[PDB]
Ligand binder design. Structure first.
Ligand SMILES: CC(C)[C@H](Nc1ncnc2[nH]c(C(=O)N[C@H]3CCN(C)C3)cc12)c1ccc2c(c1)S(=O)(=O)CCC2
Length: 167
């Protein structure tokens, strides 16, 4: 958990303009959060980047979890191996508002972070999941009580998020 170069927003929420994959390799955190879908199909975006960094071992392990346990629910999670990225991967399903899922489930999604003392995470439901990223940060700050280090791989969005929080 050797996080560096983060800006502390609240006593438990830190933020950096960084690629979560590169952060995971440098930091070696106890937990890395994946922005998953309910069938754990890591086809693109953040989930595809983390799977590629494990040389597809994450996808094979995820298919075996799904065969035995069935899909997750939107707002839910599961803990699987972190492989070379972390001790554990917390797969969390935030709502995909571009597909009509309820934005209120973003609170349930962040609530899953509270079962882990320290986590490296992306901004849930942002990007192609369609949520307003400034609203996602507000829900994170209001809901997560354990220590969360957010990696946001876009300087333009990082600057808008920091400006919005410090208003
Ligand atoms: C909003 C954007 C900036 C954000 N994207 C990111 N944030 C953090 N770390 C990121 N890594 C990457 C990435 O592609 N790394 C590669 C690039 C080469 N490298 C060796 C690995 C993107 C990343 C973001 C956050 C959440 C969500 C999305 C996108 S999504 O569209 O995948 C839908 C799910 C939710």
């Amino acid at each position: 958990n050797s996080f560096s170069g983060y800006l502390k927003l609240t006593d438990n929420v830190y933020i950096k303009n960084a690629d979560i994959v590169e952060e995971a390799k440098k930091v070696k955190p106890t937990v890395v959060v994946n922005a998953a879908n309910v069938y754990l199909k890591h086809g693109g975006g953040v989930a595809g980047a983390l799977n590629k960094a494990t040389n597809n071992a994450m996808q094979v392990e995820s298919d075996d979890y799904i065969a035995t346990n069935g899909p997750l629910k939107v707002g839910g999670s599961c803990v699987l191996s972190g492989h070379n990225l972390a001790k554990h991967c917390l797969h969390v399903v935030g709502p995909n508002v571009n597909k009509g899922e309820d934005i209120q489930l973003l609170k349930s999604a962040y609530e899953n972070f509270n079962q882990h003392e320290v986590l490296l995470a992306p901004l849930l439901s942002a990007g192609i999941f369609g949520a307003d990223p400034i609203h996602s940060l507000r829900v994170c700050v209001d809901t997560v009580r354990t220590n969360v280090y957010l990696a946001v791989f876009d300087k333009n969005l990082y600057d808008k998020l920091v400006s919005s929080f410090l208003e």
